[PDB]
Amino acid sequence: KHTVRAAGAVLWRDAPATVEVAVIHRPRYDDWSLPKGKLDQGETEPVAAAREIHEETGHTAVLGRRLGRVTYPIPQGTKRVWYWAAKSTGGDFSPNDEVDKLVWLPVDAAMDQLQYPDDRKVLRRFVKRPVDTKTVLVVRHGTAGRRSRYKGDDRKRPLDKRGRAQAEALVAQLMAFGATTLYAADRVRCHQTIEPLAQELDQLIHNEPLLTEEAYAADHKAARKRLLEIAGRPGNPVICTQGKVIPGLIEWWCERAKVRPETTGNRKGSTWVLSLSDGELVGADYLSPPDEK
């Protein structure tokens, strides 16, 4: 009942029935499996997936759609693994004592190579939908204290200490999915959330008056329109906004596209990873704040 948290991936490259996937061998278990490992202190599942892919296969990669969760018993209690689709961005495997072989296989043959039922289940998920996706990241701003007694939402109220720390932690989280462009509702706490990422990308953050809670409540259709407008642009946008805005936009998009989120929440510092194939939503993955389970 203690949970050892881990992440990994179906790492792929071009040759759905075209694509090749990576399967690894480990001497210590003499198993064939998917690359993965334990979260380090301070790490989120996406950040650990990318790191473990790199350490185990030599490859950098961009994460896309989440492919569900697997659990199994270990002496410390229960092993929990979240898996992502990850597109290789290059690298070269070198055999070692931890992982001594890596084979790239079409899905077909990878299904037969993978010895664990739960890995085959993940690979079944992977082929269920397109994997060459682009990504919209919708982020609820970090912790910023408590609303004041006044009407409206306190335009200038800043992130608190914990929130500033969530902002910093979100850089590696959002980079894992290849974020390229930045957008924030017209509130200071929304900008401050994505400022560390802005510095890292050396990028400017677009301001979004249409996506504040006041504007969403006065004209929800214009917010929706704007979201699609941004999603349509080239690149992988981060859009940081507020708690009364996100659930409505995410539900609206999921319903119209018949996409079922596997997890749901709306915490401050959380991220929805919205995977698109040819402008259609194919996944909506809720990621917890970086400082929460």
Ligand X SMILES: Nc1nc2c([nH]c(=O)n2[C@H]2C[C@H](O)[C@@H](COP(=O)(O)OP(=O)(O)OP(=O)(O)O)O2)c(=O)[nH]1
Ligand Y SMILES: Nc1nc2c([nH]c(=O)n2[C@H]2C[C@H](O)[C@@H](COP(=O)(O)O)O2)c(=O)[nH]1
The pattern of x and - marking residues 26 through 65 that bind Mg ion according to CB under 5 A reads: -----------x----------------------------
The pattern of x and - marking residues 79 through 98 that bind ligand X according to CB under 6 A reads: x-------------------
Interface pick for ligand X out of 33, 166, 192, 271 (rule CB under 6 A): 33
Beta pairing class for 134-140 and 205-208? unpaired
Answer positive or negative: Cα dihedral of 99, 18, 69, 242.
positive
Interface pick for ligand Y out of 33, 44, 88, 113 (rule CB under 6 A): 113
Q: What distance in Å separates the CA atoms of residue 155 and residue 163, rounded to the nearest whole number?
A: 16
What three-state secondary structure class fits 77? strand
- Reference 283, options 245, 255, 256, 254; nearest CA is 254
- Spatial neighbors of 179 by CB under 8 A, at least 6 apart, are 135, 137, 197, 201, 236, 237, 238
Instruction: Please report how close the Cβ of residue 52 comes to ligand X at its closest, in angstroms.
Output: 7
Q: Which of residues 118-177 bind ligand X (CB under 6 A)?
A: 118-119
Q: What distance in Å separates the CA atoms of residue 47 and residue 8, rounded to the nearest whole number?
A: 10
Instruction: Please report how close the Cβ of residue 24 comes to ligand Y at its closest, in angstroms.
Output: 11
Interface pick for ligand Y out of 30, 97, 202, 278 (rule CB under 6 A): 30
Please spell the DSSP secondary structure of 56-71, one letter per residue: HHSEEEEEEEEEEEEE
- How many residues bind ligand Y (CB under 6 A)? The answer is 6
Q: Which residues are annotated as a binding site for substrate?
A: 26-29, 31, 36-38, 72, 79, 98, 116
Residues at the site binding ligand Y, with contacts judged by CB under 6 A: 30-32, 112-113, 115
Residues at the site binding ligand X, with contacts judged by CB under 6 A: 6, 29, 31, 33, 36-38, 70, 72, 74, 79, 116, 118-119
